[PDB]
Design a protein around this ligand. Structure first.
Ligand SMILES: [Cl-]
Length: 275
């Protein structure tokens, strides 16, 4: 009941708009954890979670997805300090983020992209069922447990409760943001999530994101730089429909021909990651 007594802090993993993230270990049982600090002064978005005092929205969102098993990193604990909040979060080991992984290995073979993409889809369907919209789905926000072949979502700090009405606020990653956001500053949750998923799938099979500038995003023309099957190109181009309502639902994505016969996570690691 200090925190620096319960957790042995390790090196800095990185820092940015999410705060500062350290490697740590729960002292009790040697459990690998991640320890993420954010100055209160730097917290744009605030909540109160069914119980009732003042926390960052990020804690409210994490508490909502952290129940039972899933492909999201779970919140294990959190601490209020005078000028900041500290979250204790699961840490896979060994781990690589998907951005790191694609930078080092290049474009993913379709079979591996398919298993990765499938697990992302289950993780997002999980958040949605819990009333949570992530708002920053991207490679770097996807952790690969290298031994188990399991992907995990991180960084709910720009998420929101899911609703059926319009969003007018966004502070996720621009290049994964949809053309209605660029053009109008208006989006709806599921359909904007779906766009960012077409961006990620393109990134997995091509080794880079399709669009860099606003003009490309809103032009929405997809040029393939790598060899990609027709059924994969089709799914991508579906997710990246310029009209939001022309995009697939989660069910349509997961029923797509390209998505059939997905590997299990263990098979995935055995074939593609063990090494
Ligand atoms: Cl900070």
């Amino acid at each position: 009941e200090p925190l620096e007594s319960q957790y042995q802090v390790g090196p800095l993993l990185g820092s940015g708009g999410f705060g500062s993230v350290y490697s740590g270990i729960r002292v009790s049982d040697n459990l690998p954890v991640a320890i993420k600090h954010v100055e209160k002064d730097r917290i744009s978005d605030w909540g109160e979670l069914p119980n009732g005092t003042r926390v960052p929205m990020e804690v409210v969102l994490l508490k909502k997805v952290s129940s039972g098993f899933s492909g999201v990193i779970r919140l294990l604990d959190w601490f209020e300090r005078p000028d900041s909040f500290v979250l204790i979060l699961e840490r896979p080991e060994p781990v690589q983020d998907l951005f790191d992984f694609i930078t080092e290995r290049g474009a993913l073979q379709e079979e591996l992209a398919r298993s990765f993409f499938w697990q992302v889809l289950e993780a997002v369907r999980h958040c949605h069922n819990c009333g949570v919209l992530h708002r920053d789905i991207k490679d770097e926000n996807i952790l690969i447990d290298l031994n188990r072949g399991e992907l995990k979502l991180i960084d709910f700090g720009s998420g929101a409760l899911l609703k059926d009405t319009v969003y007018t606020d966004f502070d996720g990653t621009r290049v994964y943001s949809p053309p209605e956001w660029i053009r109008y500053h208006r989006y709806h949750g599921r359909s904007a999530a779906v766009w960012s998923l077409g961006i990620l799938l393109y990134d997995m099979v091509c080794g880079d994101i399709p669009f860099e500038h606003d003009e490309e995003i809103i032009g929405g023309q997809v040029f393939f730089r790598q060899r990609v099957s027709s059924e994969c190109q089709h799914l991508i181009r579906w997710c990246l429909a310029l009209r939001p309502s022309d995009r697939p639902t989660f069910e349509e994505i997961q029923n797509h021909p390209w998505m059939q016969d997905v590997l299990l996570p263990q098979e995935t690691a055995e074939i593609h990651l063990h090494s």
